[PDB]
Design a protein around this ligand. Structure first.
Ligand SMILES: [Mg+2]
Ligand SMILES: [Mg+2]
Ligand SMILES: [Mg+2]
Ligand SMILES: [Mg+2]
Ligand SMILES: [Mg+2]
Ligand SMILES: [Mg+2]
Ligand SMILES: [Mg+2]
Ligand SMILES: [Mg+2]
Ligand SMILES: [Mg+2]
Ligand SMILES: [Mg+2]
Ligand SMILES: [Mg+2]
Ligand SMILES: [Mg+2]
Ligand SMILES: [Mg+2]
Ligand SMILES: [Mg+2]
Ligand SMILES: [Mg+2]
Ligand SMILES: [Mg+2]
Ligand SMILES: [Mg+2]
Ligand SMILES: [Mg+2]
Ligand SMILES: [Mg+2]
Ligand SMILES: [Mg+2]
Ligand SMILES: [Mg+2]
Ligand SMILES: [Mg+2]
Ligand SMILES: [Mg+2]
Ligand SMILES: [Mg+2]
Lengths: 72, 46, 122, 227, 77, 242
RNA sequence: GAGCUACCUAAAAACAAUUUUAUGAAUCAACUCGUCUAUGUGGCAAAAUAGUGAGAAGAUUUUUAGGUAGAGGUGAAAAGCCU
RNA sequence: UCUCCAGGCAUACGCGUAUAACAACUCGGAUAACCAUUGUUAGUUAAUCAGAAUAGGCAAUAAUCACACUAUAAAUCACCUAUAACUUCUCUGUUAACCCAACACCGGAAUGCCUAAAGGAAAGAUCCAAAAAGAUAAAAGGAACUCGGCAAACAAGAACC
RNA sequence: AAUUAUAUAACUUAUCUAUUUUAUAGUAUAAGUUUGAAAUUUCGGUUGGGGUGACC
């Protein structure tokens, strides 16, 4: 299934085999598949961190094209 | 007495005081992990 | 002073600390501190008879490799199911209810080998 | 992470292992000073409702046989194992209890005064004025809560209507319903106060830590000048 | 009469049922379909689960009164 | 770099994409719209203009609502829009004194309230304001039905409204069975609030509840491609015969 | 952040020989502490060495795990201790 | 082979290949030899050593060679009734001159056995200065020293505020 | 020391309940009054060393 972990990310969760249903398994229930509100500020920071990386990569390509055309 | 030997290693203490399960037990500890993830730390916890 | 980057394994830590190296369990630890191996839980290697078999590890460099055509659901369906339905449609003895006649499986429950969820290893 | 050791629901005469506190709470902070260490002790579950008729039995006066008078680590007074029917239960022992004695536990409220034999439990209505009592209970059926320390005896000063005045060991007068149950006589270890600890180490055996080494009327304006 | 067993050590009382259940004719939306707990949805009520076969390692005994050899008259052993 | 959209528009963007977009149009209107609740803890300005006493000139005036804190416990009750006022005061009510933290707490009561449409008595934590509002509304059912989401200010209150609306929408015979005449009278009294059954289902649901509801509606096991190809084959074969 | 240190909780451990009114007694090891002197003073050591000394069945010492957190904790009060 | 010194071997906790052989002689050991260094290859083997079905009923009686005794601080599942199951060996630890002290640190570091059968080397070569440190010996005297018998002594006794 | 002080602890009036012929009792709150656990802020100038008196 597609689930949100406690860190605010979306990850594919692989199911495991158990002999009892999920609602009766105390070990499984202790696992959390939700994020509390204190994670939203970190969610934005990741998006902005990633956006900077993409901006630098696109800029560098444009700079590299300048060198090619100037050289050739 | 001579100082500098305040670290008395014990793996049980180390994992209980600074381990993965300890950090996720409280929201403040989870935020500690989030900060280290955003910095890019290779080691999030002991 | 501890090493944070190296992996946590059973060689490290006190004696009370133990963990597996990834081997599948072959039995159960019952009460009274007794291990009971289960014969069914122990994998059994199904090895064929290789007498008279003509295929060897390598192939002639003169053997032509074919055009790559990965198998698809449609390709499998045409080879196996299409001729039967087509023949039955011409004879007219076809109905929706009897798709099992041509090889459809309504459910995977009760099969030794279930396609989903998979219940057998490679 | 602190769980109280007082987690046993079923009454038994088997001694129970006690965990010490040190003066801490469930939070883990000191709340009372001077508590630490001491000798390891076992809890013997005392029964303070003397008139507890046995299971599947009528609520009528019954008798019990005194097996042994033991020493209690958890109390100043000494306890006595008393047996009756098929039941054994610890109780507080009076001044003169001995092994093999028989003690009565009565529900009957005597219209006339009942002869007072030390160790027997009667409703305060049954007792006559002036009889020393111990292990009194504020409310009928509550269970003894007062005068259960070593050597302490309370006098029954007065009875009017269905209420009696009990003079507590501190000389503080208390009133209760005459239906309340009291045990005749003073509690055992009448000489507990004469004990001499003698050395500092003996107190540390008893779980007592040493005291700290650390060492307000406001005049009214007319009197402020003349202070 | 003093009762043995301090309340703090007893099994905690069940949390109150969601008020949506009180309302008649309304089907609550719960996290049952998710297959995991979430703090902001209603808590499902599950019917008692039966394995459908007997597992010796997790056998559960019947109560005293349901035992075949239960007898009214006590026997002192 | 910069974000393409201002941060305040981010919530609207999410509602316009993904499973949120598939939610019913009427439900999204409730989410999208922002309406100010009726004043409770401050006096509104009667007019839009007043005369400034000092200079004697007509001055525009506005209503600035007091920020009110609604505890999570309030969602289990029917407070009449009341809440906790977290603020400051001036000791002795003079500007030149100390600024002191002050919290004004509502007076809460537990009361028994009877719903005719549900024919059930609920125990609710309530304020005197709610009781006054119920009196103005001529009954507990009218108060719940008339009051909007903003003024009601309770998840329990919104849950009660959905039950009443669904009960009216279906004309469910589960109300006072064996007394069809009494059932009709109650429904007639509240006939003004009837709405389509589909709309009543989504009344009062939070966004998370709506997404779970929508997920359940569209949840389906995948179709075996054996069936799909057979249907395609049969149609082609049937067409050829035509 | 209590793997140091302060105090506490749980589970454990150690104490030879010699005398004694039979023990917070005596003599004196192991062990714990740190009186006085010399050395050392970027040293072997960010508090040590070498002697000399104090206690050494107890309010003793020591081990493992747990607990109390800075507007705080702990303190046989040195305003001492909390890497 | 000789001369001399006198905490060794195990386990726990910790450490994480420092283990062993070969090859190297850059770096590391505060210098060489040789390797504790670099590279390559190897290694630690366990059913006994070590780690890792359910519901009821129920208990007065320390330990100390436990007997006699004395004591006070008052001190460790079982057994029974029913129910269920009706033959099993997989997994993990195991090397070392090692750990905490920035160091190959005169430091810190728990338990069992033992006290040399185990484990080790104070001197790279030479010289015999001053000053400085440590040890021993002292004619006659014996606190005249010094703030003070500090330190030392073939002394280590007495007494009082 | 000046300013505060729903830390506690009392009270009074409302509010809300019951009862009551107006009385009692209570009290998820508000406004006061009394206590002060605490909080915040300050240490004018001339005056051998001070003490003191003084002075501006
Ligand atoms: Mg350090
Ligand atoms: Mg330690
Ligand atoms: Mg004092
Ligand atoms: Mg500790
Ligand atoms: Mg001895
Ligand atoms: Mg002694
Ligand atoms: Mg001595
Ligand atoms: Mg001495
Ligand atoms: Mg101390
Ligand atoms: Mg002092
Ligand atoms: Mg001082
Ligand atoms: Mg070599
Ligand atoms: Mg070198
Ligand atoms: Mg080597
Ligand atoms: Mg090497
Ligand atoms: Mg070895
Ligand atoms: Mg160092
Ligand atoms: Mg040797
Ligand atoms: Mg030399
Ligand atoms: Mg000499
Ligand atoms: Mg001489
Ligand atoms: Mg002289
Ligand atoms: Mg002189
Ligand atoms: Mg001297």
């Amino acid at each position: 299934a597609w689930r949100r972990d406690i860190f605010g990310r979306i990850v594919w969760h692989k199911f495991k085999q158990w002999p009892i249903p999920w609602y009766l398994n105390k070990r499984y229930n202790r696992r959390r598949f939700f994020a509390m509100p204190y994670v939203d500020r970190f969610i934005r920071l990741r998006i902005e961190k990633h956006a900077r990386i993409e901006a630098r990569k696109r800029s560098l390509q444009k700079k590299k094209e300048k060198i090619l055309h100037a050289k050739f | 007495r001579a100082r500098g030997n305040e670290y008395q290693p014990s793996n049980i203490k180390r994992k209980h005081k600074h381990g993965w399960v300890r950090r996720l037990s409280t929201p403040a500890g989870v935020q500690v992990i989030l900060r280290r993830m955003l910095k890019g730390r290779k080691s999030l916890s002991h | 002073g501890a090493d944070r980057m190296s992996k946590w394994t059973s060689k490290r830590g006190p004696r009370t600390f133990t963990k597996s190296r990834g081997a599948k369990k072959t039995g159960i630890y019952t009460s009274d501190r007794k291990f009971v191996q289960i014969k069914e839980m122990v994998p059994e290697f199904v090895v064929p008879d290789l007498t008279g078999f003509k295929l060897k590890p390598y192939v002639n460099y003169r053997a032509p490799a074919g055009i790559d055509t990965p198998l698809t659901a449609k390709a499998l369906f045409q080879e196996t199911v299409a001729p039967a339905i087509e023949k039955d449609f011409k004879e007219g003895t076809f109905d929706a209810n009897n798709l099992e006649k041509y090889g459809f499986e309504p459910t995977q429950e009760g099969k030794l080998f279930q396609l989903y969820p998979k219940n057998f290893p490679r | 992470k602190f769980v109280s050791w007082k987690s046993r629901t079923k009454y038994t005469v088997k001694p129970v292992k006690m965990r010490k506190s040190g003066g801490r709470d469930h939070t883990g902070r000191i709340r009372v000073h001077g508590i630490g260490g001491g000798h390891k002790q076992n809890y013997r579950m005392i029964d303070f409702l003397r008139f507890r008729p046995e299971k599947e039995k009528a609520p009528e006066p019954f008798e019990e046989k005194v097996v042994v008078v033991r020493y209690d680590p958890c109390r100043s007074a000494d306890i006595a194992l008393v047996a009756g029917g098929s039941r054994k239960r610890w109780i507080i022992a009076t001044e003169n209890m001995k092994a093999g004695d028989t003690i009565l536990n009565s529900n009957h409220i005597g219209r006339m005064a009942v002869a007072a034999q030390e160790g027997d439990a009667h409703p305060l209505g049954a007792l006559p004025v002036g009889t020393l009592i111990n292990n009194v209970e504020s409310e009928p059926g509550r269970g003894a809560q007062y005068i259960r320390a070593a050597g302490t005896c309370g006098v029954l000063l007065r009875k009017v209507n269905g209420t009696a005045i009990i003079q507590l060991p501190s000389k503080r007068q208390m009133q209760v319903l005459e239906s309340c149950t009291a045990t005749v006589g003073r509690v055992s270890n009448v000489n507990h106060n004469q004990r001499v600890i003698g050395k500092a180490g003996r107190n540390r055996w008893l779980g007592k830590r040493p005291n700290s080494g650390l060492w307000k009327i406001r005049p009214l304006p007319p009197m402020k000048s003349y202070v | 009469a003093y009762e043995w067993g301090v309340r703090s050590t007893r099994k905690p009382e069940p949390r109150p049922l969601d008020r949506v259940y009180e309302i008649p004719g309304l089907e609550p939306i719960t996290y049952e379909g998710k297959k995991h707990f979430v703090p902001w949805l209603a808590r499902p009520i599950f019917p008692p689960w039966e394995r459908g076969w007997n597992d010796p390692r997790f056998h559960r005994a019947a109560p005293i009164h349901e035992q075949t050899l239960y007898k009214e008259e006590p026997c002192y052993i | 770099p910069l974000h393409r959209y201002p941060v305040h528009l981010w919530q609207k963007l999410r509602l316009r994409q993904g499973i949120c977009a598939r939610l019913p149009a009427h439900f999204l209107r409730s989410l999208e719209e922002e309406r100010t609740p009726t004043p409770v803890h401050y006096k509104p300005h009667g007019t839009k203009f007043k005369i400034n006493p000092k200079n004697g000139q007509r001055e525009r005036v506005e209503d600035v609502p007091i920020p009110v804190h609604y505890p999570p416990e309030s969602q289990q009750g029917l407070w009449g829009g009341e809440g906790l006022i977290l603020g400051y005061r001036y000791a002795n009510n003079d500007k030149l004194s100390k600024r002191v933290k002050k919290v004004w707490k509502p007076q809460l009561f537990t009361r028994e309230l009877y719903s005719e449409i549900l024919d059930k008595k609920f125990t609710v934590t309530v304020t005197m304001r709610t009781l006054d509002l119920i009196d103005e509304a001529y009954g507990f059912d009218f108060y719940i039905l008339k009051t909007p989401k903003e003024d009601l200010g309770s998840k329990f209150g919104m849950d009660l409204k959905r039950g009443m609306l669904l009960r009216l929408a279906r004309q469910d015979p589960h109300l006072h069975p064996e007394n069809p005449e009494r059932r009709a009278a109650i429904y007639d009294k509240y006939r003004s609030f009837v709405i389509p059954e589909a709309e009543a289902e989504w009344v009062g649901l939070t966004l998370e509840e709506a997404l779970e509801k929508q997920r359940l509606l569209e949840e389906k096991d995948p179709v075996p491609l054996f069936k799909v190809y057979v249907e395609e084959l049969v149609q082609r074969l049937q067409e050829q015969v035509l």
